[PDB]
Design a protein around this ligand. Sequence first.
Ligand SMILES: O[C@@H]1[C@@H](O)[C@H](O[C@@H]2CO[C@@H](O[C@@H]3CO[C@@H](O[C@@H]4CO[C@@H](O[C@@H]5CO[C@@H](O[C@@H]6CO[C@H](F)[C@H](O)[C@H]6O)[C@H](O)[C@H]5O)[C@H](O)[C@H]4O)[C@H](O)[C@H]3O)[C@H](O)[C@H]2O)OC[C@H]1O
Length: 329
Amino acid sequence: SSLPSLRDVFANDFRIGAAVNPVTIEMQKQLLIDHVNSITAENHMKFEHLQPEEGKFTFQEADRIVDFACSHRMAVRGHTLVWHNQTPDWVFQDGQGHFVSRDVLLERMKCHISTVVRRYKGKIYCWDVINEAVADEGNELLRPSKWRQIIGDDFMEQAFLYAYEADPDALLFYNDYNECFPEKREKIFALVKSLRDKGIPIHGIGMQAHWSLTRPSLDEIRAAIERYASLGVVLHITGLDVSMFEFHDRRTDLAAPTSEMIERQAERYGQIFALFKEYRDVIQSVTFWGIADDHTWLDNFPVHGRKNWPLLFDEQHKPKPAFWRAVSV
Ligand SMILES: O[C@@H]1[C@@H](O)[C@H](O[C@@H]2CO[C@@H](O[C@@H]3CO[C@@H](O[C@@H]4CO[C@@H](O[C@@H]5CO[C@@H](O[C@@H]6CO[C@H](F)[C@H](O)[C@H]6O)[C@H](O)[C@H]5O)[C@H](O)[C@H]4O)[C@H](O)[C@H]3O)[C@H](O)[C@H]2O)OC[C@H]1O
């Protein structure tokens, strides 16, 4: 009540978002209403939750998310159309269980993108069209995937063009994680630059920002922002969280964060939002992958069955020390 509202604090800088589903919308309703002006579906706008079988569209959960957002004047980011994960097997198969033609996968991709994007036209202002296509390791530019396998390397071009035709007023994003590690950063840059150079309607890069207390460094975040902004795209931070564990830290028996963890996280969040505010001219939206520590996918990834404390509010929805540093930049 005397607490500052995130969206108001950053009114002149960027929207503040949260990834939700119908359960967490209920469980965290007041936090969302008090703090965010933007909503993303954590799972219920992915392919498997929209077209689980060919011709069977299940919009019910996505609809509730959108209805919530509209009834509280929140923008909506659509997530996500084309991705190597959470896409049912039928998409790539024929009756015989073999892989489909390039042309058949294109028709399925187009049908899906047109049905989904047209339904929410005028309520969803941007879409993560392509998710995580760039390789996370090695020196190949692109990760392997059945989309890429079957269609070829121009599947991303096609997807953006399909999405643009379905709603040409939407901002279309390439979305990815580890976006600030230099070698991956240069792949993302090179990929997006190539698409823009062919006139493909890609308007933005989504920086997932699934970050740790240490990685990436502030200098790596700054360099990535400037590298991407130089392409003329808009930047969204799309899944911000700050894990208490580094990647190598697979501990399962921490029942609570240490006070050192909590303190360093507050500092880390303060520094990060200072950096975001500095680049307010190119960052238009900052979405957390959740909103309070009672729900986070980091509880079970990358270690199943533990607990993480990655967000600005604790499990009782009370502001953490990271909250105070974040709003005071
Ligand atoms: O049934 C369960 C589901 O309910 C649940 O579904 C959902 C899964 O998706 C979640 O939303 C996702 C989360 O964010 C994005 O996907 C993530 C992106 O982060 C990746 O993790 C990175 C892996 O790589 C690490 O880097 C190391 C560096 O060291 C080496 F060089 C290695 O080469 C690298 O591996 C990074 O540190 C990690 O962050 C994940 O692989 C990827 O999945 C999506 O945009 C977004 O949709 C939902 O929240 C969650 O509910 O989970 C699945 C199922 O069990």
